[PDB]
């Protein structure tokens, strides 16, 4: 037998027993969106993989306030294959809405295929430089997560956050220094990106490097200040 421990952030649990893992509740029982493990305690939990995805790499690193709650609507930018998007949908439950944006068609097919069975995911196949194109589909959102590996991540987050994000909402960005200068220490690039977000309007709250899960990756969490 195993025990389910409620994690600090809502909608996230930890399996306890002979082996310990990070888990989320399953929206569609009896199905796995990819090759992750399922634990039945009844209620079924899918197992997060922090090496595979970067959001609960930040959770395992101990982010303070994730801005992702079961009530909230989340705008996911850079949603390749929907693997992390399924768990974000599990966190926001049936009430919350996750708008998952992806440009490339090859993860686009499987993002559509997973959003077929997951109701609360609204898939968007559209380039993230241009928020005005999918403005019909989005309302206001509580948080914006970014996983794009682009040089102008700060500009993309600026354009999307000015247009869709509410006041006092949250921005959670994953930054890799290799898609930036990459010939200096990664701390320098991270400081540059934090300064860019401050210029844009996002007031940063915290920064967390993702060792041992990713190399030269950080999660920067901040709050949007429209004023």
């Amino acid at each position: 037998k195993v025990v389910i421990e409620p994690h600090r952030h809502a909608g996230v649990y930890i399996a306890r027993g002979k082996e310990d893992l990070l888990v989320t509740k399953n929206m569609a029982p009896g199905e796995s969106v990819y090759g992750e493990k399922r634990i039945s305690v009844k209620v079924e939990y899918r197992v997060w993989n922090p090496f595979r995805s970067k959001l609960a790499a930040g959770i395992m690193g101990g982010l303070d306030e994730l801005f992702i709650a079961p009530g909230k609507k989340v705008l996911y930018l850079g949603a390749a294959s929907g693997t992390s998007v399924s768990h974000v949908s599990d966190v926001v439950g049936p009430e919350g809405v996750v708008y998952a944006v992806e440009f490339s068609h090859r993860p686009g097919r499987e993002l559509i295929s997973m959003a077929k069975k997951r109701p609360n995911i609204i898939p968007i196949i559209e380039d993230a430089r241009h928020p005005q194109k999918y403005r019909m589909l989005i309302g206001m959102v509580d948080c914006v997560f970014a996983d794009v590996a682009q040089p102008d991540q700060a500009r993309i987050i600026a354009l999307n956050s000015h247009m869709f994000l509410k006041d006092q909402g949250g921005v959670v960005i994953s930054i890799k220094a290799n898609c930036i200068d990459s010939t200096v220490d990664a701390e320098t690039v991270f400081a540059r990106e934090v300064q860019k977000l401050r210029e844009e309007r996002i007031k940063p709250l915290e920064q967390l490097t993702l060792e041992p899960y990713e190399r030269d990756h950080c999660i920067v969490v901040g709050r949007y200040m429209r004023s």
């Binding site: 195993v2 421990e5 002979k18 922090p50 690193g61 915290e206 967390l208 490097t209 060792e211």
Partner: protein
């Protein structure tokens, strides 16, 4: 060729088992956490217990920092010492899968080097001062 196929199949088995075990185990995070604070007075008054609103013993735990409001079971399941021993045994099993995989890799590399010596071509024995035996082939194009 049959020998090399056998060792390759064993290495592939061990590599898939290593991948499965690595997915099965969790790893503790060791990463820098920085908090941005607007004022120097709040910097000098920064305490992680009050900021995270959590217990001082739960500060160093990173994966599940529960707040004091949320806090306001080693027995059952399994006794604690044996449970810790079995978790360490799972980690040791994954490490042993890794060691078997790299050992089979080195064996297969040696077999493939000999199987390349068996073929058709002009080769030169190169003896390093360290004593490693290498072979360099002539610049000639395969007909």
């Amino acid at each position: 060729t049959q020998d090399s196929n056998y060792v390759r199949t064993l290495r592939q088995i061990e590599l898939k088992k290593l991948e499965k075990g690595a997915k099965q185990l969790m790893f503790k995070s060791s990463g820098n956490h920085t908090i941005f604070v607007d004022s120097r007075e709040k910097m000098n008054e920064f305490t992680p217990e009050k900021f995270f609103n959590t217990t001082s013993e739960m500060v160093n735990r990173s994966e599940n920092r529960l707040t004091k409001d949320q806090l306001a079971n080693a027995s059952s399941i399994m006794p604690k010492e044996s449970l810790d021993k079995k978790k360490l045994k799972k980690f040791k099993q994954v490490k042993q899968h890794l060691q078997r995989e790299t050992q089979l890799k080195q064996v297969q590399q040696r077999m493939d080097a000999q199987r390349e010596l068996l073929k058709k071509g002009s080769k030169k024995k190169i003896v390093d001062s360290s004593g490693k035996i290498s072979f360099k082939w002539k610049k000639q194009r395969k007909r």
